[PDB]
């Protein structure tokens, strides 16, 4: 199936995304830290990464910076921040999309499809 990795410390968000993506027939992998997410990214061959930017071991922009040295996998970022400067930095660092919370699952799903079609 399509493999999606979620990198997010916040347990409720992880569970919420996993249930939504599994129900659309995707295989979901999870990591709770930036460092573990990078390990899983290299391990699991995700077709897409949904990355929360507020992680306990660093700003998620550092995940993108590291990841982009060795992977072109699509990345959709999530943030509690709506600040324009944050959106610009994350996209310019290599994110493919950015959704500020709160957001609807339906929009996330549509944006997931764009990111997956384009790489197909």
- Give the footprint of its own copies on this chain (CB under 8 A): 72, 84-85, 87-88, 91-92, 95-97, 104, 106-107, 109-111, 113-114, 118
What is the distance in angstroms between the CA of the first residue and the CA of the last residue of the chain? 13
Binding partner at 52 among Ca ion, its own copies, none, C-beta below 5 to 8 Å by kind: Ca ion
Closest distance to its own copies from the beta carbon of 14 (Å): 22
Pair of tokens at residue 96: 């493919």
Site stretch for Ca ion (CB under 5 A), options 28-36, 48-56, 84-92, 108-116 = 48-56
Pair of tokens at residue 101: 């919370």
Quick one: 38 or 77, whose CB is closer to its own copies?
A: 77
Quick one: 66 or 116, whose CB is closer to Ca ion?
A: 66
DSSP classification of residue 23: T
Q: What are phi and psi of 109, to 5 degrees?
A: -60, -45
Quick one: 47 or 52, whose CB is closer to Ca ion?
A: 52
CB atoms within 10 A of CB 39: 12
> Rounded to an integer, what distance in angstroms lies between the CA atom of residue 70 and that of residue 88?
22
Quick one: 57 or 92, whose CB is closer to its own copies?
A: 92
> Rounded to an integer, what distance in angstroms lies between the CA atom of residue 57 and that of residue 3?
24
Binding site for Ca ion (CB under 5 A): 9-10, 52, 54
């Amino acid at each position: 199936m399509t493999n999606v990795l979620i990198v997010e410390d916040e347990q409720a968000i992880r569970r919420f995304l996993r249930t939504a993506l599994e129900g659309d027939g995707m295989r979901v992998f999870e990591a709770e830290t930036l460092q573990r997410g990078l390990l899983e990214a290299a391990t699991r061959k995700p077709d897409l990464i949904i990355l929360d930017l507020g992680l306990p071991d660093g700003d998620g922009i550092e995940f993108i910076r590291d990841l982009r040295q060795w992977s072109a996998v699509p990345v959709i970022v999530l943030s509690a921040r709506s600040e324009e400067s944050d959106k610009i930095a994350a996209l310019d660092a290599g994110a493919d999309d950015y959704l500020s919370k709160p957001f609807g699952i339906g929009e996330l799903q549509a944006r997931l499809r764009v990111a997956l079609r384009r790489h197909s």
